[PDB]
């Protein structure tokens, strides 16, 4: 397999799947570096976030465990097609980029928080991350270019 990916076995069905420990993506299909990428994200903050505050909520009090549950729920809805990433980012991202459907614009290595950067540059175009953790909170990242 490519770097970043490993083969795993579903705990519930026993079927082979693939997991990326850089992006925290997981998928059933066997997966097949850019100078700059463009990403959107949805951030869910928690009480240990660097700044436990956002446009949504002046005092963010949720636990990091509660923040992860919210992230996992949004990922489920996005993957089911029940909701679009853009819709959920606009409504629920704890960051002012919510106003741009989560878009952060284009960037190179050396700009973003490292876990976010590493996930961003390891995603394929159009691919979405699993939960990514930074000092800001927990992120869902969508690489758009």
UniProtKB/Swiss-Prot annotation:
Enzyme superclass (EC): isomerase
Locations listed in the record: Nucleus; Nucleus speckle; Cytoplasm
Positions of the PpiC domain: 34-145
Post-translational modification: Phosphorylation at Ser-53 by DAPK1 results in inhibition of its catalytic activity, nuclear localization, and its ability to induce centrosome amplification, chromosome instability and cell transformation. Ser-53 is dephosphorylated upon IL33-stimulation of dendritic cells.
Annotated tissue distribution: Expressed in immune cells in the lung (at protein level). The phosphorylated form at Ser-53 is expressed in normal breast tissue cells but not in breast cancer cells.
Entry's EC annotation: 5.2.1.8
GO MF terms held by the record: beta-catenin binding; cis-trans isomerase activity; cytoskeletal motor activity; GTPase activating protein binding; mitogen-activated protein kinase kinase binding; peptidyl-prolyl cis-trans isomerase activity; phosphoprotein binding; phosphoserine residue binding
Disulfide topology: none
Positions bearing Phosphoserine: 53, 90
A Pfam family that the UniProt record links to this protein: Rotamase
Record PROSITE patterns: PPIC_PPIASE_1, PPIC_PPIASE_2, WW_DOMAIN_1, WW_DOMAIN_2
UniProt subunit comment: Interacts with STIL. Interacts with KIF20B. Interacts with NEK6. Interacts (via WW domain) with PRKX. Interacts with BTK. Interacts (via PpiC domain) with DAPK1. Interacts with the phosphorylated form of RAF1. Interacts (via WW domain) with ATCAY; upon NGF stimulation. Interacts with PML (isoform PML-4). Interacts with BCL6. Interacts with FBXW7, disrupting FBXW7 dimerization and promoting FBXW7 autoubiquitination and degradation. Directly interacts with RBBP8/CtIP; this interaction depends upon RBBP8 phosphorylation.
Record remark: domains: The WW domain is required for the interaction with STIL and KIF20B.
Name assigned to this protein: Peptidyl-prolyl cis-trans isomerase NIMA-interacting 1
Organism: Homo sapiens
């Amino acid at each position: 397999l490519p770097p970043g990916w490993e083969k795993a076995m579903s705990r519930s069905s026993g079927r082979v799947y693939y997991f990326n420990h850089i992006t925290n993506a997981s998928q059933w299909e066997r997966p097949s570096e850019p100078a700059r990428v463009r990403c959107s994200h949805l951030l869910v903050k928690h009480s240990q976030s660097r700044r436990p505050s956002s446009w949504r909520q002046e005092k963010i009090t949720r636990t990091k465990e509660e923040a992860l549950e919210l992230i996992n729920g949004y990922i489920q809805k996005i993957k089911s097609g029940e909701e679009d990433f853009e819709s959920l980012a606009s409504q629920f991202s704890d960051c002012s980029s919510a106003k741009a459907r989560g878009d952060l614009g284009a960037f190179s290595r050396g700009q973003m928080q490292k876990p976010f950067e590493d996930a961003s540059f390891a995603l394929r175009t159009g691919e979405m991350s699993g939960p990514v953790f930074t000092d800001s909170g927990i992120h869902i990242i969508l690489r758009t270019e």
